[PDB]
């Protein structure tokens, strides 16, 4: 494989401008105004956990803010979606989303105007702040960033329905399933990749759940087995790639997290037996990709892809 | 008897004591072996985050379970 560089000049200036603009930027909703307890629920402006986790790291020096949510997180998106575009060419019954449509549906120019919206996706955050209301606040930031600038600099590229449409992509509103576009589905798929990197072998194999499936269980269901962990081991790569932590898989250390025997039997049916040694963070190439878009986007496009990807 | 605790990429260390223990009392454990303070410390079990007040007994630990350990670095 080796994936070369798939984002044309249009899409990289768009990646600059949210970088320069939001991704670069401190996260403002911190420090003790924003902590919060249970217990507390008003005592602050916060009424959820996590504004204060993770707001910046230091190397050789240098603040890299936002870490979880930064320039490389959503680069690495990107990537996933390219990838997952030509796995659904693959399938011969392709998921059908809420709209009667499939990734297969999407052009390669939709694909383009798809990956600009990626750009935008966590673009709005304040925090690392999890908790409902943070989250539906700050999507609808990065949806409002998103509509900002298509409506001022890509009204030659997409038009007044497909701002809205993008919009509403990056906004997750309350009421909109995880597929209820083709376009919504592949960012949120692209999304829900990226959290393998920060995920016990529970969420990512088991389904932190009885009702959802897990992350790779939902890329097996999707693409099947084989491209489903050719996926998930590209997202890995792409993971050391940027310098961060890759966790370990062990299939045989299932049964021991407390999941009842029924869940644990019926992934290793899903998934089959994973041996695979995780990898501690590089701070180097942490730095490489989080601090402009060309160090980023040179990182990337070097990995390797499965052969599957490159085939007509 | 012996647990494993493990962050996400498998750095593994093994525990002594017993299901009298509290959560709380197994991160000050963990605190003494590699110097953690415990409100850095995330202890998962089943995919969900554990309390400080409750026992192993309570979340079913038992022989050879593995805990996952995450280090809240907060933003520093
Ligand atoms: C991969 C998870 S994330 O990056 O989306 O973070 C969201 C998640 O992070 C917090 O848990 C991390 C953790 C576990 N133990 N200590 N910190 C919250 O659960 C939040 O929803």
Redesign the pocket.
Known sequence: GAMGSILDPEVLKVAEYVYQERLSKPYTEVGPEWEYNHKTPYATRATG??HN??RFITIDDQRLHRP??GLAHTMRTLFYSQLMYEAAKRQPHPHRCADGRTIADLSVQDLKKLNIAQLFFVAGRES?A??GDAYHRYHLYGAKQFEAYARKHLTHLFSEKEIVLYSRCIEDRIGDRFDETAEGYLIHLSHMI??????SPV?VFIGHSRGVSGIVPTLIQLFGREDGLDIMHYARSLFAATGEAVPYISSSEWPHLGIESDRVERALKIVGSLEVEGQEADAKKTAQAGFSVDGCYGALVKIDTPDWYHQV | MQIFVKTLTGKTITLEVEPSDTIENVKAKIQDKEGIPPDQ????FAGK?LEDGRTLSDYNIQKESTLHL???LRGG
């Open positions: 956990t996590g986790l993770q979880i949510h690392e999890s908790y990226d959290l393998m990197r920060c995920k969420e | 410390q995330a202890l998962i985050q995450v280090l809240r």
